[PDB]
């Protein structure tokens, strides 16, 4: 939109001269008997309105910059010039006037002549490295807890845990299958692989609860990745998925298949991955952006109810 | 109450509070993750390190930049960065502050939306705005009309602006910027016999660049000078204490900006693309573009670069034309300062996209409220 403000509303009503001074990020009128006396430590916006035969108004906007004026003030003049011009529907011509270099037209506006006075209102302007605190989750204990459907477990973080056996990771997936309490599951940097990814994919067809899964920094490959993304065809719960930093990058036909596979997913809102190719990278970004806006469409028809 | 300003570039986040003359936080825009091949139990439960933290640990991490050539490419790490900025750096509750963000000039439509999506859905900001970087830099210089050369760590742009707005058809773009220039200085120094490949060797080359490099006024003269004497050589002290001499590499590195062939780019030089950009504009604004050339961003810091631009643009422009290059001293931060001012203006409360506006109209709202 376009800005209103009380001086905007008085601006360019009729032939004449208006002069404002930038004061602490606001536009303030210069008293009409002070016109032509310009503090060299300040910045000004000047509007020259002329009558046209039609009865409409010709505008000229000049912004006057004092040599000692501070950066915010002069930056503010230039911007105020722009907003004022916009507000007038772009019909004003913009002139930059610096002290000592001013236009003859500008100077011609003061019959009595232009004075500089020193001074003005004051500016509106006003480590460690590698190791801390290993991950203490007990894998066994936790795996157990998932089987029994423990409602105290809403979060499972295996991140950075070294030396977990693959069939145990596989077992976690098998265990998460009917769980109704685990919304989050982070295995980053576990040396997990495609078998683990396959298991997880199977899991995701049945599982209605987990919203967030983190595979970062693993050995998963394109067939692991992809297997998960086909699975997500049957899954409307998972909103977030992160595979950053696998040991070997999948290549383009994998990135392509990802962006393809996700076309029919209405659900996932976030994908951690670094796409090498911009084409899929963009496609995926548009899809996630569509899915996210549906969550706003609901939310609105939700909001559109309470009367 | 107070407004936040975030200027997210390819190498550096500049972030802070509107009204301040300077950003409170300036840090590497990166997200680290454990390197294969490697170790660490030190990470505890974390999938990643962000910002300064990750820079520390660069040894044991593989670093990744969410912004590439000034454009957002990895969105999940962009959220991270944004989150770190709010909570860990500015230490604020983002749902309490109007938030101004910046973007590259030609940023694709859908990215402008996505940035709008995330700010409202994930951070729940009461209101937000997205401004073009170069445009803010022009404003910070106290101008509505001008053509900005903006060159950072990731991308270099030529952005003509008239009575407050960029002219997109005339914008020119070059992928070459500081990071590429560092890699280029590593080479030719190496071809001189100093061998920098190391994760912490690059670190030193970067220092040499920001310290000893400069732009030659005339390249073949400077090369003829350097060939017939040592007047252009400068001594440089490494951390091992060794003091070595470096030659014409001083200006062959930044010459890449005017001669992108040097690194293998088929692209014309920033001087030629400046002229082109102006030439793509309406004749009647050209004289005002020629007379206001404003430089922005840290890759414009090289001593000599203004004067080199004056000369090349003079050799291109008509005989008559008044040509001036403005190189503000604070121009590593121009973009940020320009936003700081704009978001601080009394007139600004009406420019925000509100949460409510977003909730009702959806993210395409930003194409109609932000030019
Ligand atoms: N004194 C210097 N001389 C040359 N280059 C410099 C100097 N100081 C910083 N740089 C470079 O400036 C860059 C940082 O500038 P800036 O923060 O404007 O870039 P950015 O916004 O991260 O990048 P981009 O604008 O491309 O997205 C880095 O490449 C750094 O090497
Ligand atoms: Ca002042
Ligand atoms: Ca106009
Ligand atoms: Ca930048």
Residue numbers in the entry:
A (entry chain G): 1 to 126, 1171 to 1229, 1365 to 1486
B (entry chain A): 5 to 375
The publication says:
Tropomodulins (Tmods) constitute a conserved family of four isoforms that work in conjunction with one of several tropomyosin (TM) isoforms to cap the pointed end of actin filaments in cytoskeletal structures characterized by their uniform distribution of the lengths of actin filaments. Leiomodins (Lmods) are related to Tmods, and constitute a subfamily of three isoforms: Lmod1, expressed preferentially in differentiated smooth muscle cells; and Lmod2 and Lmod3, expressed more abundantly in skeletal and cardiac muscles. Lmods are distinguished from Tmods by the presence of a C-terminal extension, featuring a proline-rich region and a WH2 domain. We show that ABS2, and not the C-terminal extension, is the main factor distinguishing Lmods and Tmods as filament nucleators and pointed-end-capping proteins, respectively.
Since TL1ABS2 binds at least two actins, crystallization trials were conducted with the 1:1 purified complex, as well as with addition of excess GS1-actin or LatB-actin. However, crystals were only obtained for the 1:1 complex. The structure was determined at 2.4 Å resolution. Overall, the structure is very similar to that of Tmod1ABS2-actin. However, when the actin portion of these two structures are superimposed, TL1ABS2 appears shifted on the actin surface by ∼2.5 Å compared with Tmod1ABS2. Second, the ascending loops of the LRR domain have different sequence in Lmod compared with Tmod. These loops bind in the groove formed at the interface between three actin subunits of the filament. In contrast to Tmod1ABS2, all the ABS2 constructs with nucleation activity bound two actin subunits with either LatB or GS1. Invariably, the first binding site had nanomolar affinity, whereas the affinity of the second site was in the micromolar range. Note, however, that the affinities obtained with GS1-actin were always somewhat lower than those measured with LatB-actin, suggesting that GS1 allosterically lowers the affinity of ABS2 for actin.
